Every structure is written in structure tokens, then in C-alpha cells.
Amino acid sequence: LTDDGWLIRRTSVDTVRPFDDPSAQWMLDRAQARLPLYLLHVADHAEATPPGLREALHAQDAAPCDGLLFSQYGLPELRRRLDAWLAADEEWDTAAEPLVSVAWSGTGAAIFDLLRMLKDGRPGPSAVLLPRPGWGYDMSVRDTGHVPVSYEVPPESPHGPDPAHLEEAWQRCRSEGLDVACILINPQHNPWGGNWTPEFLAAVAALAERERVPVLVDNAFYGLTAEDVRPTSAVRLLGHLVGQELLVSVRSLSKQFACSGWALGAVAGSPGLVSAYSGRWRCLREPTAGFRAQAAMAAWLGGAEPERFTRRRRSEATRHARLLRTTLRAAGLPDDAVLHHGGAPFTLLRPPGGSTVEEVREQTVVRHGVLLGLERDARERPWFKVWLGRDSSVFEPAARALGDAAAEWRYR
Amino acid sequence: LTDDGWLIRRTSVDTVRPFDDPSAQWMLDRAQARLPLYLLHVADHAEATPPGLREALHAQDAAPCDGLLFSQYGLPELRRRLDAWLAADEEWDTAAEPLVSVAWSGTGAAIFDLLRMLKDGRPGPSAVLLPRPGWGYDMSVRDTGHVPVSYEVPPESPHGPDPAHLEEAWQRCRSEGLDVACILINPQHNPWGGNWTPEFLAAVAALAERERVPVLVDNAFYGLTAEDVRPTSAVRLLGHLVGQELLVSVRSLSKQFACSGWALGAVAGSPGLVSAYSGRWRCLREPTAGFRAQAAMAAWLGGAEPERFTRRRRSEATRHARLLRTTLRAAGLPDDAVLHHGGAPFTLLRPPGGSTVEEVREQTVVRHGVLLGLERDARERPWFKVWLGRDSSVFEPAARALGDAAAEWRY
């Protein structure tokens, strides 16, 4: 499990094309050739679950736990664990009175359900303010009936956007005649890894309060900052929006805790928004599924292994950022072509000048097995995105292989 | 476990109201009093999984299997398994060339994604033809931008609707100026338990072909007919629509195989519709989740237990329909107040005349612990729906309690 070929040979090889993105074939060809493959382009930890988690899944054989459950909020032993755990972990305002609900099919799907909820009763053209680049929010915005109007997040900024970026996007809503339905923020940001500021959050809150527009917080990486980076807690700083029906946060558990297949998460915030989400806008569409996974996670999350695993992941993200930096320096990259902000486990690489970046991307897989992400800034300048949150057993050889590849890159 | 109170005490008791339907409180009060509770209103088998299925989850510890998958169609070992299994079980037309895809968050959710895919590119008002009553299709139709235009399915018909019912619905689309986007059918029908006819399916196919409208088949209960009832196979009879991009079926595995929490199912049919569903209209919304559950179910489906479990469920459903008929005759109900058609595991009870049916429904829980479903026909006449697909360990005491309740009813 020191590389990722096994994952593609099992989950991608099929008698149908597994997806039509060009990277699908790059990954297949590398994996089927049984050559080392390193997937640094998607933020997963597929190589292992945390200690104790699979055991917790098996322990739930003690009682029947594979039927549908009779709560629109998820399994109560999980829901109340998340309420306590999130309030402590994110340092929620004790004077706010939020409601917490389980999401059991992915927080991207919870965002979709939240956005279609906010389209209800809105005949007029509507906008969602969202970061660009963002983690797949754009299609959920379009598919739920809104216009995506993005605010720029520069890759170079260790703190992500500034209020001026939000204002520019708001002014495009003004001139396009689009009613703003939601402001979506991602303070520990995928893909750039910025840690967003109280300044920016206050600008978001002021716009929310002025226009009566809810804020949607994606906290997937709140718990995965670098060791020397204290995450900005948007729910703490925006606590006054809870009682105004202007705040909902979503936070995947399966990302931080290396169980992406279980698709468990928390939806929390204003009680009207969250109760409407949970029943009307989620449980009419999907079943009350995930009984066993929720019970296993309630037992696991209530114990001692979550803190140990989180501390491990944050120490790895820090060490891997440092190892990538020195590896790429030894390969000949200039210091300023390697950025790591510590708000989420991503390192950003400026691709070598003058080559077609998609070609460099493919040749890195073909020649050395490493698949990186590709993002672009507001002027379409390309950046490679390197996910750092793999176990060291995979990241150490992946880093070495990327060092081999980057020595073939020309920096002038 | 010979009742259901354990399930409500674990999954409904909380510091928030679990849902605002009045039945939530009836269920809580009975369960929290630790008096026998029998949930016969939802088609689940929460009391137990089939032999070998939980063991299959353990066996998957042998390799890492809790990350995201790199296929928009689900885990290949499951998808391949379902393709072969469905083609044999439903006797698909060997001349058709369908595509099969895994659904991993519920087939009601797959229907939602299919319906919103069919709204794409349609500014004009559009309709979905659907049965009334149906299993929750109506809100997916509305929430994906269509107008629900229902065709009547009479509870009394052991074969469900006739072509005239479909035509009446189509004519309402015509007079309202609604463009038909989809015809949804449920041949082994929830809630009435009819087994729909080749006649009706032929009328559906003729309408689909004439108007170029895809058919969406819900086959949740295809494998759960009574012992003496061969299910009508819509995909077999509609095989010619596959190549025309006019057929998609959805089939939950988790109902038949008593693992509803795993929310695994199959989406199958026209390759353009199914590939567009799988990627564009599902994987941009949902993560490629369910690795371990899909792997466990693929392994389990490769053994001998699934066929044994299915035979057992069908035997139980048939025995339970018989036991309810005898129990309710002894309680004083007329024969025409107790219907079981055998197309799915439901018995229909006509409530006592002159009582308020929601009151009778509540009092049956309060006094005897039995929760029945409530449906109505096209003239709003009420019927209780009794789910039969529970283990006998639960159903036998449930039937005794329902007999006790029904003896208090006036016929």
C-alpha cells in the first residue's frame, strides 16, 4: 500500500469507461502496468482507516442496525455526539442555540439540498456567491436554479480572499439584476489552503445581515490545518447569524477521519434552516440510511482515537509540506514556485514556464506515476495542487517520485 | 426481538422532535412505555439482515475499502455482479444492450436525479406521468421542475391500472399544455401490491414510442411477489425501448435483501440515459461512496444465500397474508375489506365505516401497538396498508394484536 495502483485496479478497471476525464485513462494505464501510482490530486486517505474505526463497525453486530431509522436528523447517539464535539472543536458561541443534523450521503449533497431549499419561492433570477476556485459548488449552484457569481480567491494569499474580492462579486450581482440567495465560504480552503480571516468573515456577515442572505460554511478541513496554524472558526465568529436564520455550516467527518466511503457529516446552525433541510429538503429525497455507519461513528467519535488520529494527520500535513518543499528545492524549483499556507493540506506548484500544463501533468504520471491536481487563478494562470494528507507510507515515496519528475522541469 | 420498540427507543428518542408527522409521537409514546410496538406501515426488515451479509462486511477488512471509488458507475465487482444477476432474474431481452450502474444513496434519490436530468433543456412546463398512489414520487417530480400528472391505480384491482387510466392522465397533459418528460411505472406496486399487466405495459410502450418519452421502471418489489405470483417483467417487455433511449429501471437491493441502511440499488437501461445519470447527474452531486458496502454486497451476491433468503421472504409474505386473512375474518371483517393481490407484500384493509380513519389509526397504536399505513383511492376512500415482509417472529404477535384491535371495529 506504498502506492495507489491497487485502488485503480480494483475501482476503475471495468468493461465501461469509468469516467471520461483524461486522467481516468492516465491512472488506468499506470495502474494496469503495475507501475507505482501516487494519487495526490483528490483529498482522500483511501489507504487506511483510523485505528478502532473498522472494529467499531463490527461491534455494531451486537444489535440490529441495518434498517432505516425513524429520525429526520439521523441516529440520535451520533447526532448528540456531533453537537457536543463540534461545539467544543470549533469553539461555538455558547449564547447561540444551533441545531445539529447528520448528513449521510456527502456534504456536497447536503450543500445541493441546502441550495435548492434556498431557491424555493424565488421566481426571480438568483445568485449564489461562492469562491473561485471552489470544490465543486458551481454545478450544485447551477443545478438548483441559481447563477454562480464567484469572488476571487488568489492562490498567493496565505489568508485567502479580502473584502474587496467579495464586494467585486456583489457588484456583479447588482449590475446583472440577480438576487443573492446564499454566500458560500470555505475558510480552510480547498484547493489553495488559505486560512481565511476574521476581517473577511466580518465582511461576509455584514453583507448577510444587510441583504438578509444566509451564509453557508463548508468546514471540511477545519480540523486539518498545519500544526502551526490555528483555524479561523466561522461558526464562532458568525454566531449572531444563527438566531437570525442566516447561518448553516456543513462539515464532513469522513474526510478528517479517513472514511470517505461512509459519507458521514454534520449540518449545523440556524434551527429553521437546519430543520427544513433535514426533513423537507433531504428526507423526502433520500432514505434514512446509514444506521450502522452512524452507530459505529458515534462510538468511535466518542472515544480517544479521534484526537490521536487528528494530531497524526496534522503532524503529517506539516511534515509532508516541509518534505515536499525541500524535495522540490533539490529538484531545481525556485522557492517562490512552491506555496504552502497551512490552512488545509495542499501545496501549490507553479508549473514550468512555456510547457502545456496538461501535457506536463500527464507526462508526470506516465514517467513517474505522480498525479497532481490542476487549478487556475483569476487570470487563468495554472497551478498544480498537491494533496498532502496521505499517510507517510504513501507520501514519502510519492514525494521522492515527484522530485524525480520535477528535475525534468525547466525553470528559468 | 418480537416487536419494534427497540428501534424507536434507539433511533427516535432525542432532544429534538424526530419528525413532525403525528405518527412520530404515537410511536415514541408506545416505545418509551416499553409496550409492544409493531411497525407495519413502512416496507422494511430492520429486525435482521440475511445470513452471511454482516459477515461479508467483516471479510472486507482484508484490503483497504473505505476510500472514494474512481468510477462513476460504482464498484466494478458489484456493477458486474448486478448486470448478470438482473439480466437473469428479470429475464431481460438478450437482443437489448443495456448499461447497468450502481446507486448507493437510495433508489428514491436515483429517481430524483433521473427526473432532474429529464428536465434539462426544457424551459416549457413539463409533466411526469406517475401512479396515484405512489411511493413518494410526487415530491421528486415537483422538486425537479415537473408537474405531477397521475394515472389512477385502483386498490381493488389485483393487476393495478388499465390502459384507460393511462390515457386519462395523458389527456390531462394534452388539455393543460404540459410536455410529458417521463412515464413512471411500478409493476409490483407499493402500496396496493398489484402485479401489473403486459396489456398495461404495452400501452405504456406505445405512448413512450409515439411521444418519444422515456419510461422509468421502479422494480423495488420485483423479487418479492407472493409464492404463487410470477412478476411481470417490465424491462423484458419493454426491451425494444433500451436502444431508443427510452428506458431506465431502478431496483433497490436493500429492500429485498433486508439491508435498507446500506441504500444499494441498480440503475439500468438505455446507455445514454444511464451514463448521463451516473456521471453528470449523480457524481457531480454525490461522492463515489459506499466502497465497503458495495464490496460486501458483491461478495454476498456471489454465494447461495441470496436465493435462499428471497425464497424465505416470499414464503413468509405468502404465509403472513394468509394469517392476516384468517385473523381478520375471525375479528369480524367482511372478505371484501381484506385484499391481498400478491404482487408485493401488502394487505389492504378497509377501515370501519363512520370512524375518523386517522383516529382509528392512532388508537390502534395506543391500545394494541400496531401502526398501519394510510392510503386513499381516487375518490378519497381510505384503506389501511399492512406490510407483510417482516420476520414471523415479529409478524405473528403483530397479527394477534391487529386482530385484537380489529375486533373493536364496527362492520
Numbering used by the authors:
A (entry chain B): 16 to 427
B (entry chain A): 16 to 426
Task: Quote the study's own text.
Despite recognizing the same S-glycosyl-l-cysteine structure of the substrates, LmbF catalyses thiol formation through β-elimination, whereas CcbF produces S-acetaldehyde through decarboxylation-coupled oxidative deamination. To understand the molecular basis for the differences between LmbF and CcbF, we solved the X-ray crystal structures of LmbF and CcbF with PLP at resolutions of 1.7 Å and 1.8 Å, respectively. In the active sites of LmbF and CcbF, the PLP is covalently bound to the catalytic Lys270 and Lys260 residues, respectively, to form internal aldimines.
In the LmbF active site, the N1 and C3-hydroxy groups of PLP interact with Asp233 and Asn205, respectively, and the phosphate group of PLP hydrogen-bonds with Thr122, Ser267 and Ser269. Moreover, Trp150 interacts with the pyridine ring of PLP by π–π interactions. The dihedral ϕ angle between the Cα–H bond and pyridine ring of PLP is stably maintained around −70° to −90°, indicating that the Cα–H bond is aligned parallel to the p orbitals of the conjugated π-system. The dihedral angle of N–Cα–C–S is −65°, and the octose moiety of 4 is within a pocket consisting of Leu83′, Pro302′, Thr303′ and PLP. As a result, the ε-amino group of Lys270 remains within ~2.5–3.5 Å of the Cα H atom, and the distance between the ε-amino group of Lys270 and the S atom of 4 is less than 3.5 Å in the calculation, suggesting that Lys270 probably acts as an acid–base catalyst to facilitate the C–S bond cleavage. Although most of the multiple-site mutations at Leu83′, Asn205, Phe236 and Pro302′ of LmbF merely reduced or abolished the β-elimination activity, the LmbF L83Y/F236Y variant catalysed the decarboxylation-coupled oxidative amidation to produce 9, as well as the β-elimination reaction. Leu83′ and Phe236 in LmbF influence the selectivity between β-elimination and oxidative amidation.
